[PDB]
Amino acid sequence: FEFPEELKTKLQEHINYFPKKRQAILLCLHEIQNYYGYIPPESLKPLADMLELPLNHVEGVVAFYDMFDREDKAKYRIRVCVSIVCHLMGTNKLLKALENILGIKPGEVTPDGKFKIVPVQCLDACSEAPVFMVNDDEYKFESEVQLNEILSRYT
Amino acid sequence: RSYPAIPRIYAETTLNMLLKRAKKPRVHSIDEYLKDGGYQALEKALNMSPEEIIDWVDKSTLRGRGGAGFPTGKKWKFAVQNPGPRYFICNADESEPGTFKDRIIIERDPHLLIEGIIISSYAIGANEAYIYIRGEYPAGYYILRDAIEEAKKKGFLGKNILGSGFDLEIYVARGAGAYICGEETALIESLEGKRGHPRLKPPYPVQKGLWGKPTVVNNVETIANVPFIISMGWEEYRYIGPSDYAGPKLFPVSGKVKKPGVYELPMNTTLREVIFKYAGGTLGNKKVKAVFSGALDCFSSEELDIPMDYSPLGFGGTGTVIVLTEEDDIVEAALKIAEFYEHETCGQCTPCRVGCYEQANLLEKIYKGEATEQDWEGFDFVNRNIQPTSICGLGAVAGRLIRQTLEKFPEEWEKY
Ligand SMILES: NC(=O)c1ccc[n+]([C@@H]2O[C@H](COP(=O)([O-])OP(=O)(O)OC[C@H]3O[C@@H](n4cnc5c(N)ncnc54)[C@H](O)[C@@H]3O)[C@@H](O)[C@H]2O)c1
Ligand SMILES: Cc1cc2nc3c(=O)[nH]c(=O)nc-3n(C[C@H](O)[C@H](O)[C@H](O)COP(=O)(O)O)c2cc1C
Ligand code: SF4
Ligand code: FES
Ligand code: NA
C-alpha cells in the first residue's frame, strides 16, 4: 500500500503546518476519510511513518475519535443528531423521512455505497433542530419533500 | 470562495457588541471588519505594555465564558509569573447540548475572535496561539483559516506585527468527535497529537500546559470581549449591564420557544425575560415545565425569576437555555442527557466509565418499561456514584441534571 500523490500532498501540507509533525494526526485522518469515504486499515501504517509515530499510537487515536469510521465506505455521511433538543423537536420525523427516501436506518449504508446514516451527539445548531449534516454541510430538517430535494444535490 | 452550508441561526442583541456583525448570518470579511474600526484595539494594545493590558482585563471583571467563570485577568496574571515560552489557546470545542453561542462569532465575525486572540497572546507573551475547533464545525474551520490568511496579508499576524517586535502565528486544529476535548487538559492532549484524556489538575495549564509550558486556555466568547475592553477602556466596559456582573453575555436559547437563537443581553436579565421578553415565549403558549442549563442543571417553572449572572443564586453555567414545555416527558428528556454522558466519558476513571454507561443502560430499561426492581435501585445508586475518583468535571456532573429531575419532578418518575 501507498497513498495516491493527490492525497499524499494534502497529508504532507498538514504535517508541515504545525510546529511538530504529530500535531497533524487528526487533520490527516479527516483528509484520509474525505478521500476514501472511510479510514482503510492499510492507511494507518504509512500515516504513522509520515507522522513519525508508532502504529499503536495511530490505531489508538482512530479508535478514540468518534468521527472516524474504519468499517464502512460511504460517499456521503448523513450525521443525524440524536441528542436532547433535536429529540424534542423531531429527530424521529427526520429518521422516518430518511428511511422513506433511502431505505436505510442509523448505522446502515445504501447498497450503492452512496449514503450512510451516522447517529451523532449534539451538533450545536439546536435552535435549528432537528439537525443533520451531509458530509460537511449542515441543515435543519423541515419535511420529507424538503429533505428529498437536499439529498438530490449529492450525486 | 465557498464554505459548507450552515443553518442560519437567529441572533439578536440589545447591546450591539459581540453580535454587532454576527447578528447578520454571513461571513464578515476583513474589509468589512476594518470599516467598523476592526483591528484598531489591537493597534492600541501594541502601544501598551502587556502588564497594562492584563490590568485592564482584570479591572473589566471579565470572567471565563466556557462555563466555570474563572476571572480572565487573574488567569493571565498567573501564567505570566511563570517563565516562557507561553502558549495561548482558544477553546472552540463547543460540544455541550444547547450551547451554540461560540459558533456564531466564529462563522460570522471571525476577525473579532482573531483580534482578541492577538491581543491576549501579546498580553501573556505567547508567540504561538491555537484555535481548537470541534470537527463537526467544518465551515467554522475553513472560515477561520481564510480569515487568518486575510489578517496575515494585512500585517496583523506574522513576525514583528505593525513594527511592534511582537511575533505571532495562529494554528487551527480540529477535533474529531469527542466532547471531552473541550476540557482544557484533554484539549491540550489532543493538540499534542494524542487521545483526549484529561490530566490531573493542579497543575493548572497556566503552570504546565502545552508541551508542559505555561498555557492560557480561554473560551471563544471570553476572547471576543477582549477587543471591546481595549477599545472602550475598562471603566466604560464596567458600565455595561449591572455594576456587580458587568459586560455583554450571549445566551443560546432552544427548545420550545417561538424564536430560538442567540441573544446578546446584560447579565441582570432574568431567565423569565430571556424566554418571554426576548425569545417570544413558548411554542403554542404552553406552560414552561423545565429549563435545562445545557447538560448541567435542570430549573423548574418556580425558578424562572433568577438572574442570568455569575452569582450564587444566578443561572450561571454558559447561560444555555433549553426550554421544555408541559407536553415534554421529563424521563424521556433525562434519558437523552444520560445517553450524552454514556457517549462522552473518556473511560480513564472507573466510576465515571461504568457509571455513565450504567446510568444510560438502566434509564433506557426504565423508560421502555423493561426494568426490574433491582434495575430501579441500581439506577438510583449509579446516578449517585459517577463522581468518585473522577479527575475532571464530566464525572462530577454526569448525574447532576438527572438527580435534579428526580428531585423536582418525582410524580413523573413515579409513573415509570
Ligand atoms: N461550553 C461547553 O461546551 C461546556 C462543556 C462542559 C462544561 N462546561 C463548563 O465547564 C466547567 C468546568 O470547567 P473546568 O473543569 O475547566 O473548571 P475549573 O474551575 O477547574 O477552571 C476554570 C478555568 O480556570 C482555571 N483555573 C481554576 N483555578 C485556577 C487556579 N487556582 N489557578 C489558575 N488557573 C485556575 C482553569 O485552568 C480553567 O482554565 C463546568 O462548571 C461547566 O459549566 C462548559
Ligand atoms: C467535560 C468538559 C467540557 C468542556 N467543554 C468546553 C468547551 O466546549 N468550551 C470551552 O471553552 N470550555 C469548555 N470546558 C471548560 C474548560 O475546561 C475551560 O474551563 C475553559 O475553556 C477556560 O476558558 P474560560 O476561562 O474563558 O472559560 C469544558 C470543561 C469540561 C470539564
Ligand atoms: S471524570 Fe470521566 S471524562 Fe473525566 S477524565 Fe475521568 S473518565 Fe474521563
Ligand atoms: S441537540 Fe441536536 S444540534 Fe443540539
Ligand atoms: Na471535539
Author numbering:
A (entry chain A): 6 to 160
B (entry chain B): 2 to 417
Quoted from the paper:
We therefore sought to lock the peptide bond in place by exchanging a nearby residue, G129E, with serine and aspartate, respectively. The longer side chains were intended to occupy the position of the bound water molecule that has to make way for the flipping peptide bond according to our structures. Structures of the oxidized G129SE and G129DE variants were refined to 2.4 and 1.9 Å resolution, respectively. However, no electron density for the nicotinamide ring and its ribose is detected, while the ADP moiety is well defined. Thus, the nicotinamide might adopt several positions within the binding pocket of the variant. The 3.5 Å distance between Oγ of S129E and the carbonyl oxygen of E95F is longer than the 3.2 Å from the carboxylate oxygen of D129E to this position. Thus, while both mutations fixed the position of the peptide bond, the Gly/Asp exchange seemed to exert a much stronger effect than the Gly/Ser mutation.
Complex I couples the transfer of two electrons from NADH to ubiquinone (Q) with the translocation of four protons across the membrane. We have determined structures of the electron-input module of complex I from the hyperthermophilic bacterium Aquifex aeolicus, encompassing subunits NuoE and NuoF that contain the FMN cofactor, the [4Fe–4S] cluster N3, and the [2Fe–2S] cluster N1a, respectively, both in the air-oxidized and dithionite-reduced states at resolutions up to 1.8 Å. Here, we show that the redox state of N1a regulates NADH oxidation in complex I by inducing a conformational change close to the NADH-binding site.
